[PDB]
Structure formats: structure tokens, C-alpha cells
């Protein structure tokens, strides 16, 4: 039961790291485009 | 016991991916600010 609880909490951590990677991919793409456009 | 060992090692991987996401969030924010300031 401790291992099931650990995997459930680890899944929540993975969802948070996916949210953060998608935020950073959109922000670096924005900056790339801004520099290309300049 | 193999599954406990797997979850322990996966937790170490997740900590490494959190370190890397926080490094990249600070570096893209720095670049955003630099461009705003220019």
C-alpha cells in the first residue's frame, strides 16, 4: 500500500514536470521567434 | 523489493528533472528580462 501511494504521488510529480516543460518550450520558442523577427 | 528499489531510483530521477527545470526557468526568465530591458 505504501508503494501504490508512492506511485500515485510520483505520477502527480511527473504531471507537474510536464506542465513546467511545456511552459518553457513555449517561452523559448517565443524568444527564438522574437529574435528571428528582429 | 525490486519495485521499492525502482521507486527509490525513480525519485532520484524526478529530483534531477526538477533541478533541471528550475535551472531553465531561471535562464529563460533572465533572457526575457534582458530583451525587455534592451
Amino acid at each position: 500500500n505504501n508503494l501504490l501511494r508512492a506511485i500515485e504521488a510520483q505520477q502527480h510529480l511527473l504531471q507537474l514536470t510536464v506542465w513546467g516543460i511545456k511552459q518553457l518550450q513555449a517561452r523559448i520558442l517565443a524568444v527564438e521567434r522574437y529574435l528571428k523577427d528582429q | 523489493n525490486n519495485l521499492l528499489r525502482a521507486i527509490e531510483a525513480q525519485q532520484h530521477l524526478l529530483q534531477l528533472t526538477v533541478w533541471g527545470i528550475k535551472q531553465l526557468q531561471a535562464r529563460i526568465l533572465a533572457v526575457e528580462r534582458y530583451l525587455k530591458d534592451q
Binding site: 505504501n2 508503494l3 501511494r5 504521488a9 510520483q10 | 525519485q11 526538477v18
Partner: peptide, 25 residues
């Protein structure tokens, strides 16, 4: 969503502390 980086940090820390206890126990 409403998510901010300060909230993201708090939630990472909360889930990491929990997993540590579950794994030790």
C-alpha cells in the same frame, strides 16, 4: 492553469516529502 512557479515549487516539495516517508516506512 492558474498554476504559478511559486505554487509549482510548493506542490513539488509537498509530494517529494510524502514519497520520502512512504519509501522509509
Amino acid at each position: 492553469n492558474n498554476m504559478t512557479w511559486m505554487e509549482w515549487d510548493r506542490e513539488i516539495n509537498n509530494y517529494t516529502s510524502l514519497i520520502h516517508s512512504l519509501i522509509e516506512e
